Amino acid sequence: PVECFEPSMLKKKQLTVLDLHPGAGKTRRVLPEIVREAIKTRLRTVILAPTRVVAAEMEEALRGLPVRYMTTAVNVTHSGTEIVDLMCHATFTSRLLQPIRVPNYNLYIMDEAHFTDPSSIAARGYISTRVEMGEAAAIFMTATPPGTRDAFPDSNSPIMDTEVEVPERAWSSGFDWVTDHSGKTVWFVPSVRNGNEIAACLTKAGKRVIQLSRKTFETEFQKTKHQEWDFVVTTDISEMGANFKADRVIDSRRCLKPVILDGERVILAGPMPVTHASAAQRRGRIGRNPNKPGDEYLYGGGCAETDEDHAHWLEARMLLDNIYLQDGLIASLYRPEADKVAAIEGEFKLRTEQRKTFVELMKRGDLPVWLAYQVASAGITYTDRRWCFDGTTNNTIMEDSVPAEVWTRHGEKRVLKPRWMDARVCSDHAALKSFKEFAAGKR
């Protein structure tokens, strides 16, 4: 990997991983360098941001430079120059799945290129394949290249690393060091539910707590920038543009993991150890200010690279199987991620109509990729919600120890019992609320 940009990297067949460390100016100094060169040489380019938060942050760094922002996160104006596009990872992949026309970009710049969202993994597969075919160049920007075993990379400022016992439940004693802290803390929890319990405990202790999840991030991250807080309790938002003014990170280093069981359902297993890259990214929230040496990283266990049981690898394959490159050719996953999934090439390729349903189930439907695939491949149309109720008895969804029920579109009260069970649609209150509305045909 490389830690500084050279115009050499923009030539076709070049894939460069710009690794570096949190706050070294990736988006602030290096990204405008690349974009300026791309515009000067009239190189058709797309910039890929992990989130809309990052996209807006990029706009600030790229002001003055002609960029077509293809996101609602940025106020766009006319136009003239058509060289560099900017959009989110998910938008990029979604559009490749849709009939709409995506430019054959000759340069791909992916920010936070370790992001393990299925759309991001798929995007890297597409991009790396295009580079290998000699049709483009690519720059992957990330502090943690896929496959890294370094949980403690360099930082702008000295970091105090300490392994401790980290609570994952409410506590009455034994963890004074948590609350005996006058600074600001970012706390990475194993799940939203766990975060709720920890937040309530901290609030009871008189702390101001903001909670974030992967699904509330885009709208609620801004609270961390605009209101007073002592703790940010969050799931892994490390690479979503999570820049905080903090002096401490508490890291359980554990995560719930969606796992496909017997190829018929998805459970949430664990919590299990996070990867070295994940731990490095979480730790990377601090040690950013050279005027403030001695930020603390307190972690609660070890790391592991055995994450092949995570569903996002196969879900990436499901996405990539439905992206067209050229006749009979299906893109491979990015090489460092290629060994993560056992699959038959093209086995998830859907015909035109089913692919449209697949896309709408993921977008408007807001269903997990695996679940959306089951429904779409079954030949079910988007608004046909009968599958939400005709599952087997062990697929019954529970709400407060009692079978969940919804008022269906057909004016009938039915037990929530999906034909395919994916634990991610009912992992927490917000998720279950969303799925019940889906089952009722409200979207």
Swiss-Prot record:
Residues the record annotates as the site (Involved in NS3 ATPase and RTPase activities) are: R282, R285
Write down the superkingdom of origin.
Answer: Viruses
Q: Where is this region: Important for RNA-binding?
A: 11-14
Q: How is it modified after translation?
A: Ubiquitination by host TRIM22 leads to proteasomal degradation.
Q: Where does ATP bind?
A: L20, H21, P22, G23, A24, G25, K26, T27
Per UniProt, residues of the Helicase ATP-binding domain are: 7-163
Record's subcellular location:
Host endoplasmic reticulum membrane
Q: Which residues form the Helicase C-terminal domain?
A: 158-337
UniProt short sequence motif DEAH box, positions renumbered to this chain: 111-114
Membrane topology per the entry is: Peripheral membrane protein
* N6-acetyllysine: residues carrying this PTM: K215
Q: Which residues lie on this side of the membrane: Lumenal?
A: 1-443
Q: What does this protein do?
A: Displays three enzymatic activities: serine protease, NTPase and RNA helicase. NS3 serine protease, in association with NS2B, performs its autocleavage and cleaves the polyprotein at dibasic sites in the cytoplasm: C-prM, NS2A-NS2B, NS2B-NS3, NS3-NS4A, NS4A-2K and NS4B-NS5. NS3 RNA helicase binds RNA and unwinds dsRNA in the 3' to 5' direction. Inhibits the integrated stress response (ISR) in the infected cell by blocking stress granules assembly. Disrupts host centrosome organization in a CEP63-dependent manner to degrade host TBK1 and inhibits innate immune response.
What interactions and quaternary structure are annotated? Forms a heterodimer with NS2B. Interacts with NS4B. Interacts with unphosphorylated RNA-directed RNA polymerase NS5; this interaction stimulates RNA-directed RNA polymerase NS5 guanylyltransferase activity. Interacts with non-structural protein 2A. Interacts with host SHFL; this interaction promotes NS3 degradation via a lysosome-dependent pathway. Interacts with host CEP63; this interaction disorganizes the centrosome and inhibits host innate immune response.
Q: What is this protein called?
A: Serine protease NS3
Question: Which stretch of the intact protein is present?
Answer: 1677 to 2119 of 3423
